[PDB]
C-alpha cells in the first residue's frame, strides 16, 4: 500500500512539508466517481513510485482541510510540488487521462 492516508493533523506534515510530488485526492464515501477512481489511484501509486506519492483525504472525516484549497466538488485531485499546489483536476477521469495530467504536470 503506497497510498498515504491523510488527516487534518497530518496534512501539513504529510503534504505541505513533503520533499517532492504529492497527489492529494479529496473524496467522500457517497461519491460514486470518487469510488470509481480509487482502483486507479492504486495503479498510479505503483507506476509513479519514485516520481510521486499518492495521498487521500476523506472530507467528511476530515472536513476542515478542503475549504482551505477552495474545494467545492469531488473528487478533486490537487498535485502539490513541495507543499505548493502545482495543478488541479475536478471530477473523474480514466487511467490514460490521469497519466497525461501527471506526465504533463510533473515535467
From Swiss-Prot:
Keywords of this entry: Acetylation, Disulfide bond, Electron transport, Host-virus interaction, Redox-active center, Transport
GO CC term, one of those recorded: cytoplasm
Sites marked Contributes to redox potential value: 32-33
Catalytic center residues: 31, 34
Pfam families, per the entry: Thioredoxin (PF00085)
Disulfide cysteine pairs (residue numbers): 31-34
Site (Deprotonates C-terminal active site Cys): 25
Modified sites of kind N6-acetyllysine: 68
SUPFAM superfamilies membership: Thioredoxin-like (SSF52833)
Domain Thioredoxin: 1-107
Record-level GO BP terms: cell redox homeostasis
Organism domain of life: Bacteria
Family: Belongs to the thioredoxin family.
Subunit structure: Monomer. Interacts with bacteriophage T3 DNA polymerase.
Function: Participates in various redox reactions through the reversible oxidation of its active center dithiol to a disulfide and catalyzes dithiol-disulfide exchange reactions.
NCBIfam families: PRK09381.1, thioredoxin
Protein name in UniProt: Thioredoxin 1
Originating species: Escherichia coli (strain K12)
